[PDB]
Structures are given as C-alpha cells and as structure tokens.
C-alpha cells in the first residue's frame, strides 16, 4: 500500500510536525546520553574485583 510523495509533502512540512520531529530527535539523543550517564554511574558505584 504505497502513498504519494506529493501527497505527504503537503502535510509533512507543517509547523506542528517539524517542531515534533525536532523535539523527538532531541529527546532520543538526550535519552542516549542518559544511557551513558546511567552506565558510568553503575560502573563507578560497583565494587571492584579482589586483588590476586
């Protein structure tokens, strides 16, 4: 079920949607550096191995 480029691009450029994409594609990139902060916290908080 294909739908036309020249149909979609009547709606796809509208202010609410381009704002929505900037919001989500920022929230994702913030979520990812959130994964990184979470992991680095766990790695620092975890007790390191016994010495041989």
């Amino acid at each position: 079920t294909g739908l036309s480029k020249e149909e979609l691009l009547k709606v796809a450029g509208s202010p609410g949607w381009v704002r929505t994409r900037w919001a989500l594609l920022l929230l994702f990139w913030l979520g990812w550096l959130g994964m990184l902060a979470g992991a680095v916290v766990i790695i620092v908080r975890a007790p390191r191995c016994r010495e041989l």
Binding site: M35, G38, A39, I42, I43, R48, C49, R50, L52
Partner: peptide, 24 residues
C-alpha cells in the same frame, strides 16, 4: 569493560546498558 574488571564478572546491569548504547 574487562580492563576495569580484571578478575571477576562485570556488573550485569552495566553490561546490558553498554550493549544497548552500542546498538543505538
């Protein structure tokens, strides 16, 4: 992670977070 955990299991939750950071 093994350079920071030379003789014991890596913290399992940290391993799953770093796995997902890679795929993303």
């Amino acid at each position: 992670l093994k350079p920071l955990f030379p003789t014991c299991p890596v913290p399992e939750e940290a391993a799953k977070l770093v796995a997902c950071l890679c795929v993303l």
